[PDB]
Write a protein that binds this DNA or RNA. Structure first.
Ligand code: ZN
Length: 675
RNA sequence: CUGACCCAGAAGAUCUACUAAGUAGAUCUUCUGGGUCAG
C-alpha cells in the first residue's frame, strides 16, 4: 500500500473526527488518496453487525470511470462491494436494489436527482458518507445544489432521521462577484452554508512538503498592437455598405427596426443589430401575398450576407486573412448550390468582382497578424532552451483550433511541433463533436516522448480531465473568472513552468490583474474564517440556511395554460404555407411529426438519413429530417424553421424551442394514419 | 449481451455584448428517448 504523506494526514484529520469539512488543496497533491483514507477510516469504525454506505459524486464520465476503477482496485482486498451507475449503465437494474446490495457507489448527480424526484430513493438516510468532487459547483441550480436542497429540507423540518456526513474537495472556493474582502467572506460563508460545512481544512504545519510536491508557475503578460493597415477590412466594409444600401432600397424603414445606435463593422454590437433586424423583417405581413413573399425573401438573403461578412471580419481580426477568405468562399459555394436566383446572382457577382483583390491581399507576407508573430517568437524561444517541452494552448472557439493547427503545420519555423486537437462533444451548426474514445485516444497520445508535444484545446481541458504535466501554458485571449484562472495555471505543475497571456486588448490584462487581486482577497477571507469559534460559525451557517430555505420555499410559481386555437406554420424564408397545428403529432413527447398527404407535396427530400427542404423553387429552406420509429419512416420538423401565424388575429410570432410554443399536443397514434 | 456510430428532445454552469432584470452570440457538461453496424 502507498504510504500517506504528512500533509495528507493533516488534511484528513478533521474528517476522521466526524465533522463536515471542505478540503481545499492545490490540484495534483493527491486529494483522491485523502478521500480514500477517509473512506477506509469511516467503514472500519462501525461495530460488528453494522455497516456504512458511501456515495461518491463525479461531474464527468471519464472522472466517474477513473474513480470507480481506483476504488474497486483499492477496496477489493477488504471485501467491500463497489459499483457505479451513470447514463450508460442506468436502465439495466433497478437503482434501489443496486444501492441496497453494495457498500461504495459512484454516481453522476443527475441520476440521484432523478431517483429522488421519482421516489425510488425516499431519503438520503441510507448513506452514511457523501463525497462531492469539485465541490465549488454547489450553487444556483446545479444538481449538487438540488441534492443539498433535499438534505437541508430534511434537516430543517423536524424529521428525527439520521443524516450522512458531508465531505467536499476543491482547489478554489471562489469569490462570486465580490469586490472587497467583506463580500468575499460573505460569499465563502454562503458556500459553507450550502454544503453544511463547519470546518475548512488547509495545509498549515506541513507546507514545505507540499511546495516540494506541487510547484506554482510564473505568470507573464504580453500586449501587442493591432494591424496598422487593413485592406481586407476596407474591401469587406465597402461590400457591406453596398449590401446595406440594397437592403435600404427595398425597406425604407430599416434604420428604425432596432434601437442600437452607432454600429460599427466587425463587432459584436453589429452582430446583435443585424440579428434583431433579421428577426424584425421575418414578421412583416402585407395584403398581397406574392409581393410580401418577394420582399421577405430578399431581406432574408441580404441580412444573411451581411451577417456572414461580419463573421468573416471577426475571424480575420482573431486569425489570418486566409481563414476568413475560406469561410466566405465556403458560404458562397453553399449559396450558389442552394437555390441560385436573381438576387443571389447579383450578390455572388458583386463578391466575385472583388474576390481577386481579396485573394491578392491575403497572400502578402507583410499583412500577418502580429499576435501570430508574437506566439511564434514565444514558442521558438521556449523550445530553444528545452527541446523536450510540453505545451498546452487555450483558445475560445472551435474554428480557432483548426485555424491554429493549420498555421502551425504550415509554418516553416515551427517544424518541431506536433499539434493535437481537443474540443467538446456537442454538435454545433458548423462543427461536429468529438466522441469519448477519440478524446481518450488523443489524450493518451499527448505525453512526453509521444506523438504530440503541443495541444490546442477549448475549455474542455479546464476541469476533471487529466493531462500530462506541461512546462508551458499559453493563453490566447483566454481570461475568465478567478476559478478559471486558478484551474488553468494549475496545469503547468512541472518545476520551472511558465504561463503566458497573449492579447491585443488592455481590458483583458486589467481583468486578469483584478483576478489576481481577488485570489488574494479569497485567501485572506479563508485565513480569517479559520480563527472563529466553531459555535459562532454554526450559528451563522444555520441562520443563512434558514433564510435561503424560506426564500426558496416562497419562490415557487405555477405554470400557464396552452392555447387551443388553430395556427399556421409558414416557411421562415419565403412565407409559404407548410401545415396547420391540427396536423402535428408528438411521438414519445419528444418527436414532432406532421400527418397528412397534403404536407408531402410541400417538401422535397435530398440525401445519415435524408433531410427535408422547402419544395418552392429557389427557396430550399431546411425544415427537418427523416427518422425511423418502429416500422414507420416519418419526417420530423423544427419549430425554429417556421413563422407562427394566428388564423383570426393574423399576428405572426417566432419561437426558438418547442416548449415555448403553447398549443394542444395530440400524441401520435399508429392506427390514425388512415384518414 | 458487449463495443463503435448517429438522430431528436430537455436541463445546468461560464464568458462577452446590448436594452430597460431581460435579450443576443459563444463555450462546456449532463440526463431522457429513438435508430444503425460489427463481434
Ligand atoms: Zn420556403
Amino acid at each position: 500500500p502507498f504510504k500517506p504523506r504528512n500533509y495528507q494526514l493533516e488534511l484528513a484529520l478533521p474528517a476522521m473526527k466526524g465533522k463536515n469539512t471542505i478540503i481545499c488543496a492545490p490540484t495534483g497533491c493527491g486529494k483522491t488518496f485523502v478521500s480514500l483514507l477517509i473512506c477506509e477510516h469511516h467503514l472500519k469504525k462501525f461495530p460488528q453487525g453494522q455497516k456504512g454506505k458511501v456515495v461518491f459524486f463525479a461531474n464527468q464520465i471519464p472522472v466517474y470511470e477513473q474513480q470507480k476503477s481506483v476504488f474497486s482496485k483499492y477496496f477489493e482486498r477488504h471485501g467491500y462491494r463497489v459499483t457505479g451507475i451513470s447514463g450508460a449503465t442506468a436502465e439495466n437494474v433497478p437503482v434501489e436494489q443496486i444501492v441496497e446490495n453494495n457498500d461504495i457507489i459512484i454516481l453522476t448527480p443527475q441520476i440521484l436527482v432523478n431517483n429522488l424526484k421519482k421516489g425510488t430513493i425516499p431519503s438520503l438516510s441510507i448513506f452514511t458518507l457523501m463525497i462531492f468532487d469539485a465541490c465549488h459547483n454547489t450553487s444556483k441550480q446545479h444538481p449538487y445544489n438540488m441534492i443539498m436542497f433535499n438534505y437541508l429540507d430534511q434537516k430543517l423540518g423536524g424529521s428525527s432521521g439520521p443524516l450522512p456526513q458531508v465531505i467536499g474537495l476543491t482547489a478554489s472556493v471562489g469569490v462570486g462577484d465580490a469586490k472587497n474582502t467583506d463580500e468575499a467572506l460573505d460569499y465563502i460563508c454562503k458556500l459553507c452554508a450550502s454544503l453544511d460545512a463547519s470546518v475548512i481544512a488547509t495545509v498549515k504545519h506541513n507546507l514545505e512538503e507540499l511546495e516540494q510536491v506541487v510547484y506554482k508557475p510564473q505568470k507573464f503578460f504580453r500586449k501587442v498592437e493591432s494591424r496598422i493597415s487593413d485592406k481586407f477590412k476596407y474591401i469587406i466594409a465597402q461590400l457591406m455598405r453596398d449590401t446595406e444600401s440594397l437592403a435600404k432600397r427595398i425597406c425604407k424603414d430599416l434604420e428604425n427596426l432596432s434601437q442600437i445606435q452607432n454600429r460599427e463593422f466587425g463587432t459584436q454590437k453589429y452582430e446583435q443589430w443585424i440579428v434583431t433586424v433579421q428577426k424584425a423583417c421575418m414578421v412583416f405581413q402585407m395584403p398581397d401575398k406574392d409581393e410580401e413573399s418577394r420582399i421577405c425573401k430578399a431581406l432574408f438573403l441580404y441580412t444573411s450576407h451581411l451577417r456572414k461578412y461580419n463573421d468573416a471580419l471577426i475571424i480575420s481580426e482573431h486569425a489570418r486573412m486566409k481563414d476568413a477568405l475560406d469561410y466566405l468562399k465556403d458560404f458562397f459555394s453553399n449559396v450558389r448550390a442552394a437555390g441560385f436566383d436573381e438576387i443571389e446572382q447579383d450578390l455572388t457577382q458583386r463578391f466575385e468582382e472583388k474576390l481577386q483583390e481579396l485573394e491578392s491581399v491575403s497572400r502578402d507576407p507583410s499583412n500577418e497578424n502580429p499576435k501570430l508573430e508574437d506566439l511564434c517568437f514565444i514558442l521558438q524561444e521556449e523550445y530553444h532552451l528545452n527541446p523536450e517541452t510540453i505545451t498546452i494552448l487555450f483558445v475560445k472557439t472551435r474554428a480557432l483550433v483548426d485555424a491554429l493547427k493549420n498555421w502551425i503545420e504550415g509554418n516553416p519555423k515551427l517544424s518541431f511541433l506536433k499539434p493535437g486537437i481537443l474540443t467538446g462533444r456537442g454538435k454545433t451548426n458548423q462543427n461536429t463533436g468529438m466522441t469519448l474514445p477519440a478524446q481518450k485516444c488523443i489524450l493518451d497520445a499527448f505525453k512526453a516522448s509521444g506523438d504530440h508535444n503541443i495541444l490546442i484545446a477549448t475549455s474542455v481541458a479546464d476541469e476533471g480531465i487529466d493531462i500530462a504535466q506541461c512546462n508551458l501554458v499559453i493563453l490566447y485571449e483566454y481570461v475568465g473568472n478567478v476559478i478559471k484562472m486558478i484551474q488553468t495555471r494549475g496545469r503547468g505543475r512541472a518545476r520551472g513552468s511558465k504561463c503566458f497571456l497573449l492579447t491585443s486588448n488592455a481590458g483583458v490584462i486589467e481583468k486578469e490583474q483584478i483576478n489576481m487581486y481577488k485570489e488574494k482577497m479569497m485567501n485572506d477571507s479563508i485565513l480569517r474564517l479559520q480563527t472563529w469559534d466553531e459555535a459562532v460559525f454554526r450559528e451563522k451557517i444555520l441562520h443563512i440556511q434558514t433564510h435561503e430555505k424560506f426564500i426558496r420555499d416562497s419562490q415557487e410559481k405555477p405554470k400557464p395554460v396552452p392555447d387551443k386555437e388553430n395556427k399556421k406554420l409558414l416557411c421562415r424564408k419565403c412565407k409559404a404555407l407548410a401545415c396547420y397545428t391540427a396536423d402535428v403529432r408528438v411521438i414519445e413527447e419528444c418527436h414532432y411529426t406532421v400527418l397528412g398527404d397534403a404536407f408531402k407535396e410541400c417538401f422535397v427530400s435530398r440525401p445519415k438519413r435524408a433531410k427535408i427542404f422547402c419544395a418552392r423553387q429557389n427557396c430550399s429552406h431546411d425544415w427537418g429530417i427523416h427518422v425511423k420509429y418502429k416500422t414507420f419512416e416519418i419526417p420530423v420538423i423544427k419549430i425554429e424553421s417556421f413563422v407562427v401565424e394566428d388564423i383570426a388575429t393574423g399576428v405572426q410570432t417566432l419561437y426558438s424551442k418547442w416548449k415555448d410554443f403553447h398549443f394542444e399536443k395530440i400524441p401520435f397514434d399508429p392506427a390514425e394514419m388512415s384518414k
